[PDB]
Amino acid sequence: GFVRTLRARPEAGGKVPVFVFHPAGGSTVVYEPLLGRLPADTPMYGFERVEGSIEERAQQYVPKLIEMQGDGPYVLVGWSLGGVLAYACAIGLRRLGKDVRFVGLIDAVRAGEEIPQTKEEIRKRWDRYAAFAEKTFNVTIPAILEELDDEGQVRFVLDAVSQSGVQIPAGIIEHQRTSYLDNRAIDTAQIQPYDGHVTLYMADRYHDDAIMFEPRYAVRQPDGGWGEYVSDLEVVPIGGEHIQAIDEPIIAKVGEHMSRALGQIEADR
Ligand SMILES: COCC1(CN(C)C(=O)c2ccc(CCn3cc(-c4ccc(-c5cc(OC)ccc5OC)nc4)nn3)cc2)CC1
Numbered sequence: 001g002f003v004r005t006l007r008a009r010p011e012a013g014g015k016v017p018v019f020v021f022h023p024a025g026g027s028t029v030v031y032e033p034l035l036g037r038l039p040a041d042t043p044m045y046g047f048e049r050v051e052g053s054i055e056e057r058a059q060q061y062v063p064k065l066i067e068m069q070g071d072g073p074y075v076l077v078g079w080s081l082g083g084v085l086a087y088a089c090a091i092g093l094r095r096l097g098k099d100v101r102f103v104g105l106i107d108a109v110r111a112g113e114e115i116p117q118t119k120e121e122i123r124k125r126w127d128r129y130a131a132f133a134e135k136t137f138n139v140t141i142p143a144i145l146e147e148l149d150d151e152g153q154v155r156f157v158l159d160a161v162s163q164s165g166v167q168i169p170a171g172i173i174e175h176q177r178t179s180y181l182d183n184r185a186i187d188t189a190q191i192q193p194y195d196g197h198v199t200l201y202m203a204d205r206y207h208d209d210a211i212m213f214e215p216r217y218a219v220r221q222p223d224g225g226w227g228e229y230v231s232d233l234e235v236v237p238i239g240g241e242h243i244q245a246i247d248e249p250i251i252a253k254v255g256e257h258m259s260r261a262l263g264q265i266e267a268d269r
Contacts, residue, residue, distance in 0.1 A: 004029075005046075006020070006045065007035065018075045019065065019074070019077065021082035021083075023078075023082050024182035025182065031044065033246065034106075034255055037255020047064075054190075061089050062089055073099045074102075076093075076100065077103075077104035078106065084108055087198070091194055102261055103194070103196060105224075107238070108224070110221070112216060112220045126144065128215075129213060130157055140164070191229055197232045199234045202222075202237050207244075236254075238254060
């Protein structure tokens with residue numbers, strides 16, 4: 001399946017499980033530091049990669065979420081891509097009349113300026129990713145005319161790396177491939193409004209490689225773009241860079257706040 005047990009719930013009773021969603025190019029094992037900062041015996045299950053648009057991924061996740069937790073309450077948490085997935089699941093659960101009590105977005109932040117949706121921006125986008133690959137693997141990707149699938153675009157870059165002579169591990173290449181595709185899913189997402197409570201854990205800025213990939217991550221709005229879609233939004237400053245938000249020491253601030261939120265939920269069952 002696509003569900004990873006990070007801490008199993010007791011056979012009966014116990015606390016409300018926390019559902020976490022994978023980041024681009026990684027597994028839900030990244031949430032182990034967070035789990036360390038949550039109360040003892042807090043169950044946590046991780047939702048791993050599935051294919052399609054954000055909406056289509058949520059369509060696969062939501063039935064499984066319901067199978068596991070039923071009417072609720074639902075606690076949905078995600079860093080980076082995982083935050084977008086958690087949000088989409090929040091929409092789906094809410095449409096099915098489920099009790100969603102917490103949505104935790106760990107620095108899942110929209111580009112601070114409008115991204116052009118033109119033919120020319122497709123070329124520029126690709127060029128930036130190629131430049132990222134070049135620096136990452138110290139190789140020269142040849143010039144790419146390129147009207148083909150997202151899969152085909154990343155494959156051109158990664159095929160160029162392997163054919164260059166250099167020997168990158170297969171796992172590193174594969175994570176690079178899925179990372180690219182997941183980020184494409186983010187940018188083609190059609191984000192819907194949500195009337196529930198959303199907690200945005202807000203870092204200071206995006207890391208350099210994110211900005212290299214998409215320049216408009218250089219700027220971010222105070223609300224991370226979510227205010228438009230969420231009338232009940234709580235922004236919690238955590239400082240640091242996007243990439244550091246998931247680890248110690250920054251994750252302590254997330255876990256402290258989240259622990260109090262979970263405490264309140266337990267008092268209403
Ligand atoms: C792992 O990737 C490796 C890769 C790229 N690279 C080298 C990186 O370093 C890299 C780049 C980017 C990211 C993603 C960070 N992120 C963005 C968001 C987000 C949330 C929401 C909306 C959003 C979007 C909307 O429609 C477009 C509308 C509203 C909306 O929000 C209110 N947009 C965006 N969440 N996390 C992570 C790492 C080589 C591939």
